[PDB]
C-alpha cells in the first residue's frame, strides 16, 4: 500500500513516526498478508495551523491517514484494518483516537505501481514476488523492520 | 469531507487561510447538510515553483481542491458544490479563477473514518452524531467557527 | 491530470523537477491526446526520512506518482502510461526505476475542474477547447513547454 500520513511539523519525533509507521505496517501485514515491504508509509508534514476544522483552526494533533490499496477487498476487511490503524496509531503517537481521520481509497491493481512493478490482485502476492527478478527480490527484502 | 488543499507557501496569509477554509466549509455545509464539524480543510504548503502547468514552471497561483467524500451524492449536486468551491474560494483567496482545480474522489463511507468513527451514509449524520457518546459530541461541537 | 509527486527534499534540483515534469507531461500527452497545458505536476517535498519501507526509514530516493485521471480509458491504456512514467521519470530523474511507485485514481468527469472548469469526456478536449472563451484559450496556451 501507500499510506500518506498527514501531521503538524515536529508533532512526532523521529522515533514516533518509525512506531506509527510500524503500526500501520504491522496492521496491513496482519489483515491482509501482503508482505512488510509492500507498506509505504509516507509522512507529508505542515506547520500546525494548517489544519481546520468546522473553520476553526487547529493545533498539531489533527492525524489524516489516506490509504491507497487495491481494490478487491471486503468491507469487513477494510473495517477491522481501518479500526486497528486508528487503535495502533493512537497508541503509537500518544494522541486521542478522536484526533485521527483514515480514509481508504481502491485502484485496480492493474494501474498500481509498487518498486517499479505492477501489482498482482490480492493474495497473490507470494508468486508475484517469487517471480520477480533477483536484483529486485534482494531490494524489497532489505525493507522489512522483522 | 477531507478538503486537501495545495497552495504555494506564503500565498495565503492565516487570515486568508482561514477565509478559504470558511468558504470551503460552508459550501459543503450549505449544499450537503452534513455538520460544520465534519469539514477539515487541510493546507498543503510547497516552495512557488513547484508546479508546473503543460511542463511550464508555475508561480504561486494555482490552487488545486483535492475534496475526499463518501459515496452516494448526486452528480448534479457534486457539479454544484465543486462550482461553488471555485467561486467562493476565487472570491476568500483574491484568485482568479482560472487559477482554481478541484477534483472530488468518493469512497464508500464504510472505509471513512472522521474523528476515530466510521462515518455514516450522507443523510443520516443527525443520528450518528446522537448516538456518539456525549464527550465524543462535546469534542466535535467545540470545531464550528463562530 | 494532476500527478502530485512525492519526493524528498533536494532530491531534485530546480532543472531536474523541470525535467521530471516534461517526462510526465510528455508522456500523457503523447499516449492520450490531452493537450500539454492541461497536464499538472505538482511536487510534494519532504524532509529525507519521512518515507518508510516495511517499517524501514528510508533515504532520498523513493518518488511516488499519484495521478489523477478522468474516467474513460482503457486498463490497456493506463498500463502502457504507467510504464512510460516509471521509464521516463527514471531518465528524468536519474533514478532507478525499482525507487518508482505509480498510482492512478480515476473520477467522473463532471466532478472534475481545470482552469476554473469542468472537463469533458476523454478524447473531446479538442471541442471543449474551441468552446470557450479566447481569454481562456489564451492563459492555457501559454504554459505548453516543447522542447
Known amino acids: 500500500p501507500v ?11 523521529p ?12 496492521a496491513h501485514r496482519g489483515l491482509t498478508g501482503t508482505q512488510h515491504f509492500l507498506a509505504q ?3 507529508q508534514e505542515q506547520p500546525a495551523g494548517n489544519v481546520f476544522l468546522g473553520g476553526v483552526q487547529q493545533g498539531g494533533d489533527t492525524i489524516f491517514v489516506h ?3 487495491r481494490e478487491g477487498r471486503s468491507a469487513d476487511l477494510k473495517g477491522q484494518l481501518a479500526q486497528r490503524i486508528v487503535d495502533d496509531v493512537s497508541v503509537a503517537a500518544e494522541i486521542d483516537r478522536k ?3 483514515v480514509y481508504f481509497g481502491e485502484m485496480p491493481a492493474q494501474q498500481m505501481v509498487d518498486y517499479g512493478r505492477f ?3 490480492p493474495g ?13 527480490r534482494a531490494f ?5 523492520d522483522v
Not at 3 to 13: E, G, K, N
Not at 140 to 144: D, H, P, S
Open 3 to 13: 499510506y500518506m500520513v498527514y501531521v503538524s511539523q515536529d508533532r512526532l519525533t
Open 15 to 26: 522515533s514516533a513516526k518509525h512506531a506509527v509507521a510500524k503500526a500501520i505496517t504491522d
Open 41 to 43: 508509509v509516507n509522512f
Open 67 to 69: 490509504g491507497l490499496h
Open 99 to 101: 484526533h485521527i481521520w
Open 119 to 121: 501489482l498482482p490482485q
Open 124 to 136: 497473490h502476492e507470494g508468486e508475484w514476488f517469487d517471480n520477480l527478478s533477483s536484483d529486485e
Open 140 to 144: 524489497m527484502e532489505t525493507n522489512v
